[PDB]
């Protein structure tokens, strides 16, 4: 498309997420391998990520509307992430080794920053652009799948060889990507209006939503990988053939991102949520009759058609329900703080569930509680139907 | 020259020198302007730094010799340097005046570990390559100076712009820095055997000739602007001149250097210290008889003709002498750690100088000492004298 901003921004997610997927999907690998970390204290690092991203998402929620399209925010989250390579190499590896995990688990406070709540605030911000142009989220969030795909193919490639050339490679991406930012041309509440939508009920009837069907998901994907390896004979050819699904299913991801911002345009928004929580819903419930390599990987990659249809389609029931004004402040509350504070006790409690009654008798338990929320959200959630699809 | 180290480490000096040049000689005017710092408490910054180089630079030239060729300390280096650009813009700067001082002048210890402590550990690093590869160290340094011009040029005018251009600039000089690293390829001893070099005679007489030339010509430069400015019919327009000098200055300094180290080989090195004293000695009496403003120019420049005999002299003469096995130690140790040391003792008594009588007033008393040690140290320093050139 013509449009400038669209090739602008469609790079600074491409390069965001770059530097993102050197981090989030091989973490717990760079720990028990890498790093050396007992799985007993694994735990530990992601108990300070998970609290940290508490109290900086809610707070980002302010300050994405307070100032609005100003790049003020997002040049500190991108000055932070030209850190991230001395931060995993000479920072927070040998910080965990040296000194008292505890040290570097609040001092690992960053990447919750940086990442864990550094990304939501970046894609609520870019979202803003697209009401003021024309383009729609969708085409511009599709590099930062494919720029995910990159990362995740370059690690593996170069994990033989030198792993550390990929953390070098992703604080360069933070300087080109702060580029970016510069060339980037563009263009208020009081917070009386913050406690007001406690008080709305069509505020408590999406956190539901999330809660039910979001962090109930998130809990899910955890343990998969080690699952998925399960339904090999060798553990070390289904580590192998994981890699390999999720790097082309990012290529999908762009292929479904394509057309989707323009299907939920007329499946209204609400309905779009529905059809997410479904898909969700079907992946970890088809996880329960499950039992060859056939069949368990289909099911990696209906994540791939899932996620666009719930990050497009959440921004458009946003939109089209509150204002404009407050779009950025409820999408780092309802599908990060609570996400995050629901992820705390269903984390738990899904490991008393593995250890207790098996894999698959858990993911049946969640499977009914992702299309129990799913299917009450049909009739609580503000906005159309699915029955308004079928007129 | 087909030399493939000396073009790698030629060009590392060009880019770690243009990333120094762009704070050091600017860090007054980055604090006093910019930040809007009084001029009293410019003194608790440069009275910390100091501080915390004090205790790096002994403990960074014992690990700069276990290691030898190991690239391991430099890499830490160039890692910390990556953290410049989110540093001096979105840390050292807000921080600083959102806390006590105090709080965020511990900030500035990061300053000391990767540029006061940081220059003389690549110098020293680079110095043990010129006899394992065949080229002399001066050759490569001057790389430094038209680096250290090159930024600096692009610093004043930039600051019209975007100041905060030249520091983004720099942390992207930081990863080219770990490139170069990569391609180069180089490949024991006790603190015990270090405790040995204090009880030797021969250490002492370096040591004093330090603590009196060198520390005495570095205090000299301190206030030595504010001096210079005070012979233009204006102090603004006299400002620009003294930027044409620090920046062509050094394109004669790379000159001087270029045949540097082919003289100072024949002369031995010794003498060319005494050279070095000698030119430093001839700039700081010319301030005390400055009856013009063309003259103080000259003096400024004369600066640049002391700089190569020093540093190229310092490892001909190190090595020449003393073992290569502490090459790296006792030249952090005897020269930069005891002037630093030895500095923060003469800055008190100079301030105590100037408002006591004046500041060509004040300069007598520092020839005296400078030329007094000068020709003191021909007499203790083993090895030839100025009286063998005449053979
Ligand atoms: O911190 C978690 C964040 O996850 C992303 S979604 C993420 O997107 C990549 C490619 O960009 C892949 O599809 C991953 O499988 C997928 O999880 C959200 O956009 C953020 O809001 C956070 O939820
Ligand atoms: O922190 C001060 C450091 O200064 C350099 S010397 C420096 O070199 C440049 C070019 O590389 C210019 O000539 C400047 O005039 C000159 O001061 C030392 O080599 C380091 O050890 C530090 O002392």
Redesign the interface.
């Known amino acids: 498309l013509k449009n400038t901003n669209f090739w602008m921004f469609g790079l600074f997610f491409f390069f965001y997420f770059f530097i993102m997927g050197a981090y989030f999907p091989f973490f717990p690998i760079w720990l028990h391998d890498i790093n050396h970390i007992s799985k007993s204290d694994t735990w530990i690092i992601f108990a300070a990520i998970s609290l940290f991203s508490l109290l900086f998402q809610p707070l980002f929620g302010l300050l994405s509307d307070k100032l609005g399209l100003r790049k003020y925010l997002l ?2 989250i991108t ?2 992430l ?2 991230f ?2 931060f995993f ?2 920072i927070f590896g040998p910080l965990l080794q040296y000194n008292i995990l505890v040290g570097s688990i609040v001092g690992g406070i960053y990447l919750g920053f940086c990442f864990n709540a550094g990304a939501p605030a970046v894609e609520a911000f870019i979202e803003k652009v697209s009401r003021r142009s024309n383009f729609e989220f969708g085409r511009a969030r599709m590099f930062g799948c494919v720029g995910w795909a990159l990362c995740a193919s370059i690690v593996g490639i170069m994990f033989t060889i030198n792993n550390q050339f990929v953390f ?1 490679l992703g ?2 991406c933070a ?1 080109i990507l ?1 580029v970016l930012l510069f060339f980037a041309k563009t263009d208020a509440f009081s917070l009386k209006l913050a406690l007001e939508l406690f008080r709305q009920p069509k505020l408590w009837f999406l956190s539901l939503y999330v809660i039910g069907v979001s962090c109930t998901y998130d809990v899910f994907d955890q343990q998969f990988a080690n699952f998925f390896t399960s339904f090999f004979a060798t553990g070390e050819q289904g580590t192998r053939v994981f890699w390999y699904v999720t790097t082309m299913g990012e290529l999908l991801n762009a292929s479904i991102m394509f057309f989707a911002p323009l299907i939920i345009n007329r499946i209204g928004g609400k309905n779009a949520l529905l059809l997410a929580g479904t898909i969700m819903s079907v992946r970890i419930i088809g996880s329960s009759f499950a039992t060859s390599a056939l069949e368990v990987v289909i099911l990696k990659t209906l994540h791939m058609f899932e996620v666009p249809f719930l990050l497009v389609g959440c921004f458009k029931y946003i939109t089209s329900q509150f204002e404009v004004r407050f779009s950025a402040t409820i999408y780092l509350v309802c599908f990060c703080f609570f996400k995050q504070l629901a992820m705390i006790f269903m984390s738990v409690l899904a490991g008393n569930m593995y250890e207790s009654i098996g894999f698959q008798g858990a993911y049946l338990v969640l499977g009914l509680v992702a299309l129990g929320f799913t299917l009450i959200s049909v009739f609580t959630l503000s906005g159309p139907g699915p029955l308004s699809l079928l007129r």
């Open positions: 040049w500190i000055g932070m030209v850190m390579a001395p190499i000479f070098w604080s360069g300087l702060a």
